[PDB]
Amino acid sequence: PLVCLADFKAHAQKQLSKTSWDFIEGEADDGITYSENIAAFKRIRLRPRYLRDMSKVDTRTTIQGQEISAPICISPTAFHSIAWPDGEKSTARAAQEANICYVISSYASYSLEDIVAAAPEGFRWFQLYMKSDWDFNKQMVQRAEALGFKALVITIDTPVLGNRRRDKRNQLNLEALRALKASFCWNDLSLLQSITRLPIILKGILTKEDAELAMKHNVQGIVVSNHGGRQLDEVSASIDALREVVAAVKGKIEVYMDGGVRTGTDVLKALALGARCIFLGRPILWGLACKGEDGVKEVLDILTAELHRCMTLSGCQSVAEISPDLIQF
Amino acid sequence: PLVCLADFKAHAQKQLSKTSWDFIEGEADDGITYSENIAAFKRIRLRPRYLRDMSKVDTRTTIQGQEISAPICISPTAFHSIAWPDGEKSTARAAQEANICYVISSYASYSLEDIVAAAPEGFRWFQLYMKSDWDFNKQMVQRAEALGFKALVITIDTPVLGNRRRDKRNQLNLEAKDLRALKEASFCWNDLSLLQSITRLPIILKGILTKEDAELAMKHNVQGIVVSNHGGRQLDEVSASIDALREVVAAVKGKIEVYMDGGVRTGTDVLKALALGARCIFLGRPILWGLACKGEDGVKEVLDILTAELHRCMTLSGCQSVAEISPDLIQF
Amino acid sequence: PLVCLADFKAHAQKQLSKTSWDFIEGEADDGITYSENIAAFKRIRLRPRYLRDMSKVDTRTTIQGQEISAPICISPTAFHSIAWPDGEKSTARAAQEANICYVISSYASYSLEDIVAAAPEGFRWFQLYMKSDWDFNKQMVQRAEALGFKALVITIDTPVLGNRRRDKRNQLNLEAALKASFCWNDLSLLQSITRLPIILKGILTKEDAELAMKHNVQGIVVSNHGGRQLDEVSASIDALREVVAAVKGKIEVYMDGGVRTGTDVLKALALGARCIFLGRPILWGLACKGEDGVKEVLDILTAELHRCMTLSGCQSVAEISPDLIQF
Amino acid sequence: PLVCLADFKAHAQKQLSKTSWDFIEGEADDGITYSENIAAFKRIRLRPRYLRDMSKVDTRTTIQGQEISAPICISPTAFHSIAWPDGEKSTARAAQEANICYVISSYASYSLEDIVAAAPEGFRWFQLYMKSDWDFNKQMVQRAEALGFKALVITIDTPVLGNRRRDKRNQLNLEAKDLRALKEASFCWNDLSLLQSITRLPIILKGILTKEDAELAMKHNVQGIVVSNHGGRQLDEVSASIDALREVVAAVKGKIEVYMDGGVRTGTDVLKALALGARCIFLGRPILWGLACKGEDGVKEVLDILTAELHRCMTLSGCQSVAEISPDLIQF
Ligand SMILES: Cc1cc2nc3c(=O)[nH]c(=O)nc-3n(C[C@H](O)[C@H](O)[C@H](O)COP(=O)(O)O)c2cc1C
Ligand SMILES: Cc1cc2nc3c(=O)[nH]c(=O)nc-3n(C[C@H](O)[C@H](O)[C@H](O)COP(=O)(O)O)c2cc1C
Ligand SMILES: Cc1cc2nc3c(=O)[nH]c(=O)nc-3n(C[C@H](O)[C@H](O)[C@H](O)COP(=O)(O)O)c2cc1C
Ligand SMILES: Cc1cc2nc3c(=O)[nH]c(=O)nc-3n(C[C@H](O)[C@H](O)[C@H](O)COP(=O)(O)O)c2cc1C
C-alpha cells in the first residue's frame, strides 16, 4: 500500500506518460534547487522535549483569519487533468473535506465555476497571472470574488517560464480549458488593491529586500517559494530562505512556504522557523494520479497524521507551541 | 566466518523474513537519524598516545555501583523470539556469562520469571512502559524488585510509536514465544515523583537528547540517563546520539552517570562514547543480529567481539584502563 | 533534440573515437579540478529580485572596447579538425554570425589565413605560444596584426604539458599536429614589438594578478586550463574572486572553466568578470553539427543568460552585481 | 600500459590471490583512515606561481645528511615475496638504481645479508620491532650496523596488530622466500634510552600523529619522525597522515627532520607534503604494486613515475628546487 508521500511519487510515475511525469517534475536547467529543497530540510536537526503531557495534540491553525484542520494546504499547480480526468474538481472536493486551503491555479483544466460547483463550501484562494489587459484582470478578480474565493495569490517568480530541459527534449504537446500554446511590477500592485477587497498574497519571495518591498506595498501575506526549482535554478532552498524573510517581516504579516515538504517534520520545521503554514505542490498531483479525489485526500491525511505524530513526539501540544527552540542552531 | 558486528548484520538478514528484518531495522520516516547515528561516530578523529606501557589493559568498570566486564551492555529490545526461538532466555544466559548488564524490554517474548530462571545470577535492569493504572504499575515494579532487577528504565521518547514505513507497507503481522504481541501515553515529569515515591529501585531515564531535559532529570533526582534517539525508530531527524551525548554530559557535570546507545558497532565507537563522558554504552540491534545468527552463542560472540575491539583500540590509543579514557583522545 | 550544452556533450562523445574524446576531456592526473570547475559553480546561491520591469533585457557588453552580442566567447582550443572536417573555419563563421569574440588557438588545424578568409568580419583574438627565436615570435605577431586580430592572448599556465593519463594510455596518435622558458621580463619585450593589447590567460592568484598589472597588460583570463594542466588548484570561478579583488577594476578580468549554463555566466559577471569564454562546449558543438553546432551552443547559452537575467531582475549586463550572490 | 601508480594498483590486484591482495590492502576495522589518507590530500588546493624561469628543476634533497634523487622513498613493508619471488632483493636493486632510501622491514622474506648482497651500494634504513629479549635486540642492531644500514626505524603504532577484517574472514594462511612468516609488545619511551646505549645509528620514530608525542620524541633526542598512521592498518579513525603532518611540523619547529607516508600516489601529493614541512615522503603499498606487476622493473617504474610527476608539478607551480617548495603554495 501507499503509506507516505514518497510512495505516491513512485506510484504516480507509472500511471503517467513520461511526457506528463517530466512536466510534473520539470526541474529547471541543472536541477540543483529541486533536490536542494529536500536536502535543506533533511539537514536541520530537531531538539525534542519529552515527558510533557501530550494526550491532546491540536493540529489546527488559521491563515488570514480562516481556520483550517492543519497548516497543510494546496499550492497552485496547473492542469490537474494530466493526472486525473476530474482534474481540479477532485482536488476541490478533497480539499473541502480535509478543511484546508486550496489555491487554484490560473491555468486549471476546468473553469472556476465548475470547480467551485464541485465543492461549494471549500476554503480557497485564487492564483492569477496578471496580464497587460487589465480589463481581463479586474474581471477575473471580480469573477473570483463572486465565486467565493477568499484571497488572491500573485506569483512573482514567473515573469517568463523556467527552462525545463525535459519538456523541451519531449517537445511539449501537453495532452491531458485548453492548454496555452509579463511586465507586472511593484507599482502595478497599487492598482490591483484598488479593484479588489481580497487580501493579496505574494508568492515567490526569497529575499529580505523583496520582503520589505512587500510590506511597503501593504500586501496581506507572503509565500516563500522558489517555484519548486522550476524557474530560476540555483537559488536558496525555500526552507532556508524562510529564515531571512521571517526575520525581516517581524510578524507584521503571515509568512508561508512551499517547496520540498514531504514528511511531517518538514511541516514542523517550517512552523518552528516562523511559517504560518506550508503548501504542497507536486504531492497533490501524485495523489490525483494515483487515486483521484481519494488520492489527494490520502496525501493530506497522511501528512497531517505525521505532523500530529512529530508534534506529539517533540513535545508540542499545539501549533502555537512549535517554536525555534525545537531547531538546532 | 563472522568476524565483526557488520558480519552479524549481513548474515542476520538472511535467516529472517523481510517482515522481521524490516521490523528490526525500522527506521522512522525518511530514516535520517538511523544512518546519522553511525556517520556521527565515523566523523570523530582519535588522537592516540604511543609508547606507554600497555601490557595490562583493564576493560572493567561499574554502573550504578555494579561491576561489569566492559562498558558494553544490552539495551532494551522487544520480542527476541523473532530472531531466535529461545528469545530473551538465550539473551539472558549470554549476558550473564559475559557479565554485563541486560536491560529487559517491557515487551519481551517470555515472562520475566522464565527469563530470570534461565540465568539466575545475571545483572539486569527492567525497562517498563508506564500505563494509566497506578496499580498495574506498582505491581509490575514490585514484581520486578521481587525478581532481582537492580534498576528501572523509563523510556521517555515513545509517547506514541514512530512511523516505520516498512512495517506499514508490510502491514505488520509480527509472527514470532508466549506473551503475545500487543496488536497496537500521557506520562509526564510529575508522574515520576509519584513513581519514585512508590519504588526504591534506581531510575534511569532513556531517550534524553537535550540539556534542558537533562536538567529536569536531575531536578527530579533520577539515578541515571541513557542518551538515545531510540535508534532512529521514533522522532527522526534529531541529533545523532553520540553528538547529543556532549551537551547532556556537559549539563550533568558528573552528578549522575550518563550512558548512550545508537550506532555502536565497533571498538572505537565504545572508546569515543567513554572519552566523551559516557559511563558505558548499550547495544540495540547487534544483540538481535547475534540471536538471529547463533542464538545464545551469537549474542555472546557479539559481546566478546566488541569487547575484544575495545581492548584493542584502548591498547593502541594508550589507555590502560577505562579511567584513562579521556576527551584528550578526541580531536576538537 | 539537443536543448542544452550537456546534451551536446553526451552526443559529441558518440561521433568521436575514444582517442579524440579523451583528448577533449583530458583531465590531468587525478582529475580533481576538472570536476571542481563545475561543482564550484553549482554551490553558489543566487538572490533574485522580483517585480522589476524586465520587458527589455539587454545581453550586450564590450571587451577591450569591442561590442559583442553577449559576455559569451570562445576560449582557445587546439585542432578543431578532430571534431569536424572544416575545423576552425566552421567555428570562425559561427562566431562571426553570433557576433562574439573567437580566440584562435596557436595549434589550429587550418592556417590563420584560411580561417580569416572563411569569416572576414569576425571579431577575433590570437593565442600565441611564445618560442625562443624572437624573429618567429615577432613575425607571428605582425602576421596576426596584418590579419585583423584585435588582441594577443598569452597562456601562462602551460610551460610544460599537463599529465593526461587517458592520452598516455591511448598512446596519443592524434589523427584528425606537433609530435617553455617564458617569464615576466619577456613580457616587456613582446610589448615593444606589438601594439595589440595583451591578455594573460591562466592567472589563478592575486600575486600573479599584481605582477600582471605591474607589467601593464590589458586583460586577464582567470583560468586553470580546464583542469588539463596543474591539477588540484582552485576552481576558476573561485579563483575569480581574489583576482578581481586585487585588480580593483584597473583592467578587464575574464574567466573560463566549467561554464555550461546561463546562471554560470550570470555568476561570473556578478563576481566581477567582464565576460566568460567557452572551451570544450565549442568542440562539442562542432562534433555534433559543425558550424551550426557551434552557433547553437552559443545561442543556447545566450538564451539562458537572457532568461536568468530576466528571472533574477537584471535588465542589462551592467545591472548584474554581487548583491545577486549569497555570501 | 601502466602510466601512473593507480594503474599499478589495478594491475597488481590481478597477479595476486585475494588472500595476498587483501593483506596488502588490510584496512583496519571500518577502514575509515585508509580512504581518508587519500581524500585528505585531494582536498588541499594549490596556488601556482607562473612565468618564472623553470628551465632547470632540481628534485634532489637530503635526509639525515644523505643525498637522494627525490624526496620519494620506500617505507617498511613486510614479506615482499608475496608480490614477487625475488622479494626484497628486487626492491633493493630498484631502490639503489633510483638512488633513494629503502627502509627494510623487520619481517622481510629474505635475510638482511641476502638483501644487502643484491644491492651493495644501496642507501637503506632498518625498521626493527623491538622484543622482550634485548640480546636479540642489540645483536640485530649490531648486525644492521655491520651490514651498512644508516638508520634505525622504530615503529611505535603497532604494540599489537590492527584488526584487519579481511585477513580474518580469509583466515590468514600467508603463503608466499625463506625467512618464514611468523604465525603471529611492551616497548615504551624509557626503553628508548636502553636502545640508544647499544647503538650510535640515528633513530627515526615512525607512527607519530600528535604534537604531544612529537614533543616526547624530541625530549628523548631521536633524529627524525615519520608522521604516519600505518596506512590505516592499525588504529582506525585517526587523522589522515597529511593532516597530522601540520601539528607535528609546528611542534618540532625544524629541530629534527619530519617525514610522512600514507596515501601518497601522485606528484602533487609529494609536493603538498614538502610544502607543509615534510623533508620527504615514503611509499608503502605502491612499492608492492610495482613488485607484483614487473618485479624490480615494476618498483623502479613506480619510483620514476612519481619522480617525473613531482618534477612536473614543481615546474607548473613555479618551484625550481625542493628548497623553493613553501607553504605559500597551500591554500589556507
Ligand atoms: C506541474 C506543476 C504545475 C505548477 N503550476 C503552478 C502555477 O500555475 N502557478 C504557480 O504559482 N505555481 C505553480 N507550480 C508551483 C507550485 O505552486 C509550488 O511553488 C511548487 O511546486 C512547490 O513545490 P513542491 O512541488 O516541492 O511542493 C507548479 C508546480 C508543478 C509541479
Ligand atoms: C527490534 C527493536 C526493538 C526495540 N524495542 C525497544 C523497547 O521495547 N523499548 C525501548 O526502550 N527501546 C527499544 N528499542 C530501541 C533500543 O532500546 C535502542 O534505543 C536502539 O535500538 C539502540 O540502537 P542500536 O540499535 O543502534 O544499537 C528497540 C530497537 C529495535 C531495533
Ligand atoms: C581539447 C582542448 C584543447 C585546448 N587547447 C588549448 C590551447 O591550445 N591553448 C590554450 O590557451 N588553451 C587550450 N585549452 C583550454 C581552454 O582554452 C580553456 O582554458 C578550458 O578548456 C576552458 O574550460 P572548459 O572546457 O570548461 O570550457 C584546450 C582545452 C581543450 C579541452
Ligand atoms: C603489506 C604491508 C606491509 C607492511 N609492513 C610494515 C612493517 O613491517 N613495518 C612498518 O613499520 N610498517 C609496515 N607497513 C606500513 C607502511 O610502513 C606504511 O606505514 C603505510 O603502508 C604507508 O601507506 P601507503 O601504503 O599509503 O603508502 C605495511 C603496509 C603494507 C600495505
CSV table of N, CA and C in Angstrom, one decimal, chain D residues 9 30 46 81 127 129 152 156 160 191 207 218 222 302 326:
chain,number,residue,atom,x,y,z
D,9,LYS,N,48.2,-0.3,-9.2
D,9,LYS,CA,47.3,-0.8,-8.1
D,9,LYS,C,46.3,-1.8,-8.8
D,30,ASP,N,36.5,-0.5,10.3
D,30,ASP,CA,35.6,0.1,9.3
D,30,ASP,C,36.4,0.7,8.1
D,46,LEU,N,46.1,24.0,-4.4
D,46,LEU,CA,47.4,24.5,-4.7
D,46,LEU,C,47.3,26.0,-5.3
D,81,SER,N,58.0,-11.1,-0.8
D,81,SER,CA,57.8,-12.3,-1.6
D,81,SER,C,56.4,-12.7,-1.9
D,127,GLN,N,64.0,-1.1,9.8
D,127,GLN,CA,62.9,-0.9,10.8
D,127,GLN,C,62.9,-2.2,11.6
D,129,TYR,N,61.4,-4.2,15.0
D,129,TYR,CA,60.4,-4.3,16.0
D,129,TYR,C,61.1,-4.8,17.3
D,152,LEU,N,68.1,3.5,12.1
D,152,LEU,CA,67.2,2.5,12.8
D,152,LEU,C,65.8,3.1,12.9
D,156,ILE,N,56.2,2.8,16.3
D,156,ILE,CA,55.6,2.9,17.6
D,156,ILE,C,54.1,2.7,17.6
D,160,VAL,N,50.3,-3.9,19.2
D,160,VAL,CA,49.6,-5.1,18.9
D,160,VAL,C,49.1,-4.9,17.5
D,191,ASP,N,62.4,2.8,27.2
D,191,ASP,CA,63.2,1.8,26.6
D,191,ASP,C,64.1,2.4,25.5
D,207,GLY,N,55.2,6.7,13.1
D,207,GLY,CA,53.9,6.5,13.6
D,207,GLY,C,53.3,7.6,14.5
D,218,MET,N,61.3,14.5,20.8
D,218,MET,CA,62.4,15.5,20.9
D,218,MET,C,63.1,15.4,22.3
D,222,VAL,N,65.7,11.9,19.5
D,222,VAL,CA,65.8,11.0,18.4
D,222,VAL,C,66.2,11.8,17.2
D,302,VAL,N,57.6,2.7,-10.7
D,302,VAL,CA,56.7,3.4,-9.8
D,302,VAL,C,57.5,4.6,-9.3
D,326,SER,N,57.3,26.0,-0.7
D,326,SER,CA,56.9,26.5,0.6
D,326,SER,C,55.4,26.5,0.8
